[PDB]
Symmetry: C4
Subunit: 371 residues, 4 copies
């Protein structure tokens, strides 16, 4: 079986060189083989660590979305709001003014001026007291405080943001490993009194090693980026989620029950993509660019990942969305758009119900087609 | 054989996760391996229950097509006219005025205003006496009266439309199951004195269970909808028709001869798509958007499925067609367009004849290519 | 071997329904594994029946190309000129005027007016004396006279065109069979004193039966047409040429040496397509739309197949090409365009030479890639 | 294994005709399965013959890039500058004026006038003293002098360019073989006192024979050309690099250690393509059209291969790029563009580091995905 399956799943690229066939969310679809259920009976609650969210959604931690206002509203709307500790929050007193400059640059001088402007704004020094002040606004709302730090600066910044009120620490790059060789993360994560979500991790082995650090969640994928063009690396999200889910299953066995959550970030533009991510093994999803249309989004319709601001090798671009709906409408409807970019909750519940499922974990076994 | 075939027809998406390879009508083509026949010798008659139609065609039951005028003309032209009981017919005294508002909204404010306008018009209460009056116009023509009801409201609405003159009841959603769990259909169908066509059903098991309810026909596919984007569900029509045909074959055996018709609705834009649907196992086809060009179509060139009007989660859009031909010309020619959107009869007969077949049932065994 | 190969070359479309995987010219490419040869050493001569052509090319017999002038020039330039007996030649005294009307209709009213105009012009009665007069112009030039007749009217028209001077009879439809059932061709072909080329034939069995009629050549493919959209039939030319070549090999064995030529018509836009057709087994190729750019082409840059003029079910469209080059330049260069649409001879010879071959028959064994 | 693998890697095109499945750089991606390294620890040095280049890059030898200024700057920036001996350098006293005419022709009269203008400029006689003068400018800079000659004229031109100062001879056509039959290269290469790089070679056998001539490097691929359209030949670069790498491995064994470099030229538009080429087995890469944006590029944003100028069968086109960056910025950054067309060094190092590698040779074993 594994002999013939591996034969089928691999190709000879050339004499003495093989590759593994892998799949994107666009390559697959979910199938109804069961008696249909009612969408009103579908449970979309997300239980992670000590938290229960109404929706299995976290925003991507880019400043294009995540003003303090937005983060609080994400929590009010049933999801997990996530802050970028290392973007514009601690670097510019007037956060709206900084965002406005990126927008102006994009409209006046395309993605080139936008990149240049992002590079300059992110090059300004990080004022930890200003960052802490903004985190306190989120904390004082009563919503759960999740703060993202880069793998590069986690040891320096994590204690500052935890002191400021972070309930959950997100260590997120487009790609992370548990062990890095320079010129450990287990002890560091073990030392914290807050749960940690870490990523991006796209392979089984790296995932398993990351789970062994004590992380409560693993982010699969790299969000929005230009890695395919710049690095020749393109995550096949269906395969990546499924492989990381296999690591989760094996880690559950090895520990006798510790359940590490799989959170998909990448290739997610609509509610169908969310459905497919859950089907592949994800417990939850990061929503990025679809939330840029929200009235509350800091970037007014524009989106960019943090990696768009790298000073030497930017790997992201500013995109613009295609009267703004509220974040509530985007997440809960009523939808006035049939393209799956509003009422994410409704689409998720209807898909599960049509397929005969009433909870997210069970839906990870739904039948799949590859088209 | 089944071991290696299943190996070939499945893929490993990732570690411990498999998917079935499936196919669309666009993926396939019909092949001539036989002595050619004459198109004048090809029989396209469709014998279902007590009816014999000249053409194996029914219109999709959306108001964009199905005014009383249109429905009658579909019957006059040799097909089966189908009415939407739950659209605009019972909700607005002036049906042309209601249609005009959707058109105006689309031209003035794109698919957003169209969706909003459809949502509002469908939210108006259903007057069963107004609906019955319109059904009576169709009944009084002498054409066969087919009326569609949603799975949701079939128990309430079916008896009203049967009383009004329905000869055939169509229970149609984008996806239906024989058994639904809320918070049976066999007894209900068995209680009626009219034949029932039910769908959409896309899988073998659901089809077999639906056949066991007493339905005389099964609709395969979901018509036009945005399920791929909104739910992550995309019907692979070639595979779906073939799978439902296998259920039909097995149901024929189990009952000793009861023949349930397979009617394809989805992925059908031209006469070649119709040919391919029959080749895969369909006895007949629903024609939707291609008929929107007809002079008699209520929507004047525009099309939309009923699901475009859902108040919380619309899953369809208003499309516009690319001096109107008559429905007669669209169905029987002479065609002045070589793209397969007129003279559907002619294309079907010519395809069968070129492939060496003179009837629709036999054509279900034609050789296929996958390109 | 055949068990596993057939498994690999077939797919399960659905439960109990299979299809054969097939390939287009666009799917393949020719490979150099040998010592390179010089293009000046490559022999492109085409020896068929009693004729030797400098180039293995015949024009597609549509009036958009084939005025008497053009046909003669095709012969002067080293190929085989082919006349449509059943187009405009015998139907309109002023052939340029008729062509001008199609052009005017296309520019003034798109493909709809063009179709309508073609339908009307072809509906005018065929004057056999006018047709014979035009054929005599070609005959009197000293070039080889090839005349195409439809399968439908071959018994009526073939003797007229042979009397008028035809040296070769081409019986061409988009698809032909040796035996047709209505409401034989062997005896008919056997009765003629001229060699016969017949097609289109795309399958092994039909080809073998057509070879047994006495035909000296088989046309594979249907030229330009809308069969994919109108009939759900799309020829996979790489597979079709290869399958018909297998019939040729077997027919050669069965007869002890009778060699039936394979002439590809379909999917041929550039010199690379020609190369690929020969690689798959073709002895020669029909050039259609690429020749419409020739100064001598009757249609002044426009192209259409005869099937664009069918009165009830047209299956072709008028296309327009993208200071006219001469037919000599298109066939022999010098090319000033690097896209393979001029100097067809040069491209063919260079491809063979780069691959290590110096004649067309040997090149049918060249290594292939599927991309 | 080889039985089933070959079955899997081949397809039946038709009865009795097979093809090999092959792959492009676009079909693949590189995978991180290891602990990540730091990009500052990645060694990108290229050791070939007696030379050590900071970057594993050579420019494509077309005049659109390679003025003497540009060639020198390529060397100053850490790569290998390569001169076309047979382009405009020896044919026109005023090289900028000649380039200006191609640009003018392209802007005023599209790719047709550009082709015609290139044909005429290249038809002017080669003045070996003018060529030698320009080569001397490069030589006097102190940078390494690499000069390209065509396979056609290598015996005549190679001694002239070596006398003028060439340190490395590049014998480059879109496709070359070790042995050519007209109407040897080992002795010729063996007679020279300079190392030789030869190509394009895309297959194992031709590569092995070319290695046996004494060449120190093999160019895989044909640069930019229209061979797919004109000849029906399209190089699948992933497969071609891998196959030529297998020849390199076997040649290393047969000789007991002679290492022939693999240099990819074709399908390389961005840093991700470079990464993928190295992963497939390349030691270095030719950069062509991406360098046309450099302020120092002779063609001011325009690019063309030498084969665009062929007098009878041109196989290339003039393309235009989409305030000019310096060549330094294109090769070393800082990048202000996230699409992988600047800071090639940075992208290469970051990709290796993310995948867990610190040198180019080791990276040839990185895991691959086929998407």
């Amino acid at each position: 079986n594994l002999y013939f399956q591996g034969m089928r799943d691999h190709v000879e690229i050339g004499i003495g060189r093989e590759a593994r066939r892998t799949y994107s969310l666009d390559d697959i679809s979910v199938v109804s083989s069961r008696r249909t259920r009612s969408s009103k009976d579908v449970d979309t609650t997300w239980h992670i660590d000590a938290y229960k969210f109404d929706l299995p959604f976290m925003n991507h931690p880019s400043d294009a979305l995540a003003s303090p206002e937005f983060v609080i509203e994400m929590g009010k709307q049933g999801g997990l709001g996530v802050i970028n500790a290392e973007g514009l929050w601690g670097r510019h007193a007037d956060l709206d003014e900084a965002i406005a400059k990126v927008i102006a640059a994009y409209e006046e001088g395309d993605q080139a001026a936008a990149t240049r402007t992002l590079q300059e704004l992110h090059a300004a020094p990080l004022d930890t007291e200003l960052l802490s002040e903004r985190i306190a606004q989120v904390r004082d709302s009563g919503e759960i405080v999740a703060v993202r730090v880069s793998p590069q600066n986690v040891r320096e910044i994590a204690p500052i943001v935890i002191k400021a009120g972070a309930d959950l620490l997100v260590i997120q790059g487009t790609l992370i490993s548990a062990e890095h060789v320079n010129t450990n993360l287990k002890e560091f994560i073990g030392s914290l009194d807050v749960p940690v979500i870490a990523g991006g991790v796209n392979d089984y082995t790296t995932a398993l090693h990351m789970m062994r650090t004590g992380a409560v969640g693993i982010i699969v994928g790299g969000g929005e980026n230009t890695n395919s063009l710049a690095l020749g690396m393109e995550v096949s999200m269906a395969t990546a989620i499924a492989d990381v889910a296999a690591a989760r299953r094996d880690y559950l066995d090895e520990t006798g029950g510790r359940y590490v959550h799989i959170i998909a970030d990448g290739s997610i533009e609509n509610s169908g993509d969310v459905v497919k991510a859950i089907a592949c093994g994800a417990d939850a999803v990061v929503l990025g660019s679809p939330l840029a249309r929200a009235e509350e989004a800091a970037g007014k319709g524009y989106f960019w990942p943090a990696v768009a601001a790298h000073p030497r090798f930017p790997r992201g671009v500013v995109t613009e969305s295609v009267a703004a709906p509220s974040l509530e409408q985007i997440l809960h409807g009523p939808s006035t758009m049939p393209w799956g970019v509003e009422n994410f909750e409704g689409g998720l519940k209807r898909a599960l119900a049509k397929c005969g499922y009433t909870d997210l974990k069970s839906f990870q076994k739904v039948s799949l087609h590859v088209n």
